[PDB]
Design a protein around this ligand. Structure first.
Ligand code: LU8
Ligand code: LU8
Ligand code: LU8
Length: 283
């Protein structure tokens, strides 16, 4: 039998320190091809090891297709092939797009659903998984209005995270590194930041905030570890909740939720399953 492995690389949709992402075509179908830099080879190994352990399949997790290693003359080429989401990342999408109540809730409940699926151990199943780099650039928007979580290159089963999204216990180095639940609680902090980014773009009473990344008003464009530690740990700042949210029942409920993801005490933060339940009772 013929094993068709040719993928036609059609357009670069992402370039960074990680390497590149391409829209590709296999057998008439769009796929996404991440070509890893030498900088980021260990992310390919980690994600490949995870998918060799558990074949995750969930509507809110970017769908795996393949891990490919090809011998070249003087290098190894590493590709991760996934489902392709033409609308791109949530970060991208929020720059131009504003949301109504239904779309806002559908986006955030879909992210919570993906995250709870990662976090939960299923017996008989999957190991519990923490993501460790959750952020709006690592979430893709699907045409049905739900999102999916991407990039398990730092994930842990039971490279550092993006500094802007690091929880206080990561920044002050008090994280309980021998406790898997510690890593779930770091993801919940990051989830609360993403929830803030999305809620800002939800229209109420003809008002919306411009897209901004978390802590845009208190750290530099490319913040240092120290910049983040001073804001989050020493001064204990949290993202601003605009007054206009408190006129809108959905944004009032989302402000409460994001506060309960941002407690200094990691064990006080809501779990992903509790966030889902709260979101199903809003509106
Ligand atoms: C190696 O490399 C790539 C392969 C493919 C690909 C292409 N045609 C067919 C296949 C296939 C799947 C499964 C079987 C089964 C059938 C019965 N079963 C009990 C034993 C084996 C056979 C063949 C694959 C996996 C795509 C690729 O890219 C999208 C590949 O490169 C990453
Ligand atoms: C990697 O990804 C893609 C792969 C394929 C693909 C191509 N040839 C054959 C297969 C296949 C056939 C049969 C079995 C099983 C059936 C039951 N039992 C007897 C064990 C064997 C497994 C696998 C597939 C899945 C198609 C795809 O898209 C249409 C893929 O997605 C891009
Ligand atoms: C976060 O991480 C990964 C993401 C992806 C991925 C999957 N579907 C689609 C995309 C994409 C497509 C299109 C655009 C643009 C192009 C045109 N328009 C003007 C705006 C939109 C952006 C993004 C990506 C980047 C794949 C990955 O691995 C293969 C990723 O890494 C795990």
């Amino acid at each position: 039998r013929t094993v068709a492995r040719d993928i036609t690389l059609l357009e670069c949709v992402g370039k960074g320190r990680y390497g590149e992402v391409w829209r590709g075509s296999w057998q008439g179908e769009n796929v996404a091809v991440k070509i890893f830099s030498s900088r980021d080879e260990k992310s390919w190994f980690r994600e490949t090891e995870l998918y060799n352990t558990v074949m995750l399949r969930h509507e809110n997790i970017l769908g795996f297709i393949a891990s490919d290693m090809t011998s070249r003359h003087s290098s190894t080429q590493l590709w991760l092939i996934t489902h392709y989401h033409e609308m791109g990342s949530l970060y991208d999408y929020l720059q131009l797009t504003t949301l109504d109540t239904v779309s806002c809730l559908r986006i955030v409940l879909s992210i919570a659903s993906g995250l709870a699926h990662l976090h939960i151990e299923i017996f008989g199943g999957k190991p519990a998984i923490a993501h460790r780099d959750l952020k709006s650039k690592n979430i893709l928007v699907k045409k049905n209005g739900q999102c999916c979580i991407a990039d398990l290159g730092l994930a842990v089963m039971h490279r550092v995270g993006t500094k802007r999204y690091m929880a206080p216990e990561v920044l002050d180095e008090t994280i309980q590194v021998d406790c898997f639940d510690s890593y779930k609680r770091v993801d919940i902090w990051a989830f609360g930041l993403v929830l803030w980014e999305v809620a800002r773009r939800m229209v109420s009473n003809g008002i919306v905030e411009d897209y901004k990344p978390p802590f845009y008003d208190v750290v530099p464009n490319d913040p240092s570890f120290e910049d983040m530690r001073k804001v989050v740990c020493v001064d204990q700042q949290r993202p601003n909740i605009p007054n206009r949210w408190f006129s809108d029942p959905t944004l009032t409920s989302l402000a409460k939720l994001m506060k309960e993801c941002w407690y200094q005490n990691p064990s006080a933060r809501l779990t992903a399953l509790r966030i889902k339940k709260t979101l199903t009772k809003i509106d």
